[PDB]
Amino acid sequence: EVETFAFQAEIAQLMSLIINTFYSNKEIFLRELISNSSDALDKIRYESLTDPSKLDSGKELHINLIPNKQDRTLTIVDTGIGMTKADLINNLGTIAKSGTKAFMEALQAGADISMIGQFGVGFYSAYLVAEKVTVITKHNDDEQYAWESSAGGSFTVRTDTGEPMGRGTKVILHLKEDQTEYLEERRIKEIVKKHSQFIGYPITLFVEK
Numbered sequence: 001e002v003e004t005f006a007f008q009a010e011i012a013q014l015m016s017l018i019i020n021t022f023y024s025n026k027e028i029f030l031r032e033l034i035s036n037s038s039d040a041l042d043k044i045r046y047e048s049l050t051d052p053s054k055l056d057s058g059k060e061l062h063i064n065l066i067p068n069k070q071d072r073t074l075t076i077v078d079t080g081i082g083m084t085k086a087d088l089i090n091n092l093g094t095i096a097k098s099g100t101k102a103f104m105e106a107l108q109a110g111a112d113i114s115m116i117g118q119f120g121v122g123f124y125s126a127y128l129v130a131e132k133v134t135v136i137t138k139h140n141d142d143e144q145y146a147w148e149s150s151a152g153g154s155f156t157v158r159t160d161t162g163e164p165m166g167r168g169t170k171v172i173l174h175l176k177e178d179q180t181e182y183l184e185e186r187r188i189k190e191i192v193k194k195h196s197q198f199i200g201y202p203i204t205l206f207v208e209k
């Protein structure tokens with residue numbers, strides 16, 4: 001059962017800008033997704049202090065980076081708080097609308113795309129390198145969902161039948177054909193060292209073959 005939803009105009013506009021603007025410093029997408037993961041990990045950790053049962057779905061708090069050259073995907077996996085269906089369909093949109101408006105304005109106080117994370121919409125920088133983004137997510141007390149969008153003004157949400165995750169979020173970046181450098185081990189290592197050196201959770205870069 002696949003449901004299809006329209007983005008609000010503001011977010012559709014932001015995604016178009018990110019896809020259509022000439023901007024060479026694309027590597028910042030990874031910093032933004034890892035930062036999101038760290039925030040999600042902070043949240044489940046904090047909640048677990050008052051309710052330890054919230055870690056029954058997995059006690060390990062980490063981030064894995066998984067390149068797959070055959071699929072042409074880079075996946076950012078975390079065991080953070082995860083997202084509910086209401087998050088994916090309603091709440092994200094509400095938050096993202098205001099953040100987009102501010103970011104658009106700031107871009108006309110001369111700001112540059114690399115400051116996107118300060119407006120809470122850093123996720124969408126994924127579209128600097130990805131033609132399609134699939135997000136698999138599992139929050140305690142809700143089902144596992146797959147969100148997906150190739151931009152163009154719509155996204156889908158479905159109940160996910162893949163491998164159960166326990167708790168957390170996987171962001172699967174289906175890379176543009178000219179952005180395959182982000183599947184290379186030394187390139188990913190370079191970016192993590194440069195932008196994400198002090199994240200307070202283990203980041204494991206998986207290797208390939």
Ligand SMILES: Nc1nccn2c(NCc3ccccc3)c(Cc3cc4c(cc3Br)OCO4)nc12
Nearest residue numbers: 036037040080082087091092095121123135169
């Ligand atoms: N790795 C993550 N784990 C948990 C929540 N996450 C969010 N959402 C924070 C949030 C939730 C509800 C309301 C407001 C903010 C994003 C960031 C994110 C993830 C997305 C997305 C848009 C955004 Br912003 O569309 C598909 O997935 N990444 C994560």
